[PDB]
């Protein structure tokens, strides 16, 4: 809920996760997903967990493919 | 690494319903999953067709960030050409977009993942899975 | 660079009729001519559909050897989605494959070359020429 | 593609994650805020809120308004 | 991805007036907004033209921090050339900088967003929206 | 860019020039014709003449002509 | 390596007249020569404005293959912004396109090559050469 | 005036200039320029010689820049 800064390390901008918002020690590797400006840091394997929670498509989202045939 | 091609059907099925069965499945084969550009144009269409394009598209963007999008290549076009021609003789009818998705997979040798295997069963030489 | 996207309509028209007016247009704008991979699969299909596929395909390959084939990319897919959605609301009907070819053109800003102007004239943000 | 795997390293007392060049942030961004959801962490460029700038500092009246485009 | 190219007209209009209608449009289509480098130099010029450049530039920088700046590329230059040539024959007059912004949009197929529709309406193959 | 420098090497009795990956020919091209102008050599993909194909082999009447596009 | 930026003026001067003096000069500094995208849009315009676009453009394509084309970047836009603002106070008038070319050069520190140095002399901090 | 074929050598498509159309031995290095399908093989330094010869721009080529100002 606070803020941090990135830093060029090992030729990568990387990040410094605060101890206040640090990940579980049981998480060795973490998938990083790029969407627009935001970057999603999801545990390895645990990638799709963010997308399924929330981010609800609108109720009028056309389920019909309307494929000609 | 990439082994699975998600058809258009399963994508909307996930995008709309977000089923729990698909949750862990997607998580398991993360990095080994791809979608055809044909599939992309359909999901984009549904979003832009809807009354809240920016929202649905955002959900779509998130989906597309995890999976690799495959551009329709000459191999896919040629393969689909054959696929289409075969189906003519067989009499079996397959959807226009679905035809392209099938050939696209066969060209790159991917496994098709679909909730409705019925349509794809007509086309031969394809591996079809049902993740619903 | 590349300025024109050749529709499926005009390609078959040229492939079959071999029209003189088109040859000039072809020679004049040599090097500025491209086709979508979507365009390729249709002619590939048509060739294999005939009683002499290898004959027909052979002529087809020569055509594609001179033209550059443009892979249907995510940009093409997204633009096609919009075009489809736009045309959906307006009610103007455009063919599935044609929609994809149009989106490919608009994505890279190419000029569509087709004998059927009225159909593509429905699509917005697109430039259409008739070389027939 | 869009997906990209990376490992983690504790430095400066803070556990840290490398950003591969695929997900590399724009170099313009100099500060970043971190949000917490489940085990997933969300990285948003700080101060990217459009509403912030609109109520933020406003520009003087000496702006020409006229584009004075040559013509 | 990116869908809208912000004209110089509307940018200054927003920068000065800070209109509420535009804010919604901005927040709604956040992330889909870009400006040409041509657009950047004008506002940079206007800021430095004022009696408080650093003040004005500071507000300007904040704006550009949220929007992605698109470098004027050869594709933009070529498309602008065509637009200029087209408009030349037709006689419709469009501003120099505006011509360049339009070509940038058409090259990448973006939607132009501007308060002055009539001027950009002269340009063909372009989609224009007015968010004012 | 478009410009690109390369050296030369005699092989197979024939003096030969490498094509850097920038000027690398499309892999589809399998044969090439060489034209002679001053000290500059011109490399054109053989059989790229549009007029050749037009008077070349023509296609059977079993071409559907109808696109049979689904609709 | 790249040290010289060819303004629009000298390019057309060469493209039209093809002067012998420029022949050996161009040959000498091959590989150290570049042009701005602003310059490109102008030469494209002249070609497409002409009654034989395909021909002139072909000549232009050959020219552009030897020289490197530089996309207008934020640095050029910002630099031109300053350049434009300065000229306002000085009262000295410089052409719209020429202003952008000048800033583009200063941003990357290139040497301007022009047949008409008069206009560029107003702008400061630039190195101007006359290859005519 | 005849023909040849390219060959993947040293990770380059390269070319085999026939002895019939071989370059002067005094030419050690040769610039290669890419325009469309065609590739121009011009002696080092002697790059621009092809472009200036022939390839005449049309007589109606607008010399005027028509710059607004």
Residue numbers in the entry:
A (entry chain B), H (entry chain B): 0, 1G, 2 to 68
B (entry chain A), C (entry chain C), E (entry chain C), G (entry chain A): 1 to 132
D (entry chain D), F (entry chain D): -2 to 68
Verbatim from the authors:
VapBC TA systems are the most common Type II TA system in bacteria, and consist of a VapB antitoxin and VapC PIN domain-containing toxin. The VapB antitoxin consists of two domains, an N-terminal promoter-binding domain and a C-terminal, intrinsically disordered region, which conceals and inhibits the active site of the VapC toxin in the VapBC complex. Like many Type II TA systems, vapBC expression is auto-regulated at the transcriptional level through direct binding of the higher-order TA complex to two operator sites (OS1 and OS2) in its promoter. The related vapBC locus on the chromosomally integrated Escherichia coli F plasmid is mutated in bacteria that are tolerant to beta-lactam antibiotics, before subsequently evolving resistance.
To investigate the structural consequences of the vapB tolerance mutations, we used X-ray crystallography to determine structures of several VapB variants in complex with VapC. Moreover, the structures of VapBT3NC (2.6 Å), VapBT3N+A13P+L16RC (2.8 Å), and VapBV5EC (3.2 Å) revealed complexes that are virtually identical to the wild-type complex. This demonstrates that the overall architecture and integrity of the VapBC hetero-octamer are unaffected by the tolerance mutations. However, we noticed that the DNA-binding domain of VapB appears to be quite flexible and with low local resolution, which means that side chains are not visible in the regions containing the mutations. The hydrophobic residues Val5 and Leu16 both point towards the internal, hydrophobic core of the DNA-binding domain. As both residues are changed to polar/charged residues upon mutation (i.e., V5E and L16R), this could destabilize the fold of the domain affecting DNA interaction. Interestingly, plasmid loss assays show that all substitutions that cause antibiotic tolerance also reduce plasmid loss compared with VapBQ12C (all P < 0.0001). Plasmid loss assays demonstrate that reduced plasmid loss conferred by VapBT3N, VapBT3N+L7P, VapBV5E, VapBL7P, and VapBQ12L is Lon-dependent, similar to VapBL12 and VapBA12.
